[PDB]
Design a protein around this ligand. Sequence first.
Ligand SMILES: Cc1n/c(=N\[C@@H]2CCC[C@H]2CO)s[nH]1
Ligand SMILES: [Cl-]
Ligand SMILES: [Cl-]
Ligand SMILES: [Cl-]
Length: 163
Amino acid sequence: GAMAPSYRVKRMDIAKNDEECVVNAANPRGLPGDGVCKAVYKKWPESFKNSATPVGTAKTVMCGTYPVIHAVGPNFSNYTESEGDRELAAAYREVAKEVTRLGVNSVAIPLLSTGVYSGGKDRLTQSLNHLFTAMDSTDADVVIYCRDKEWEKKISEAIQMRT
Ligand SMILES: Cc1n/c(=N\[C@@H]2CCC[C@H]2CO)s[nH]1
Ligand SMILES: [Cl-]
Ligand SMILES: [Cl-]
Ligand SMILES: [Cl-]
């Protein structure tokens, strides 16, 4: 575990992370995809061998010894708000199980279902709160990655608010 488990936020490409493992915002088919998934495929393409997994689940594949946790959030274009909210909470619970199983002291994690799976809605708070609900019982250092300047400020505020 980390000596004083923390949350932090950085605004940069998650493919450049300084953590012991990465969470991919994956599609259910293990395809290269768009956005975070695209960046992860270019950096760790070996981790896409047999990475397909259903919505609301996470599947870890090693690239060398570096673990890539493929977490499949719902596409809010296809899910109702109710069923999508349940599946988005479930994906983060499965990430916390994998992070614990791997014994890592740190993890890089994007906000699931906030980009092309958002169904055109701002889901920063919804996605971040489900992240916290899952990760708060783990002792890994968590580093959240984002690309927008206003999102960086809002995620940083949400972390600082809890102290
Ligand atoms: C390469 C990179 N993308 C990041 N976040 C995405 C921005 C839009 C949806 C987000 C998650 O898919 S963090 N590092
Ligand atoms: Cl960058
Ligand atoms: Cl997304
Ligand atoms: Cl972002």
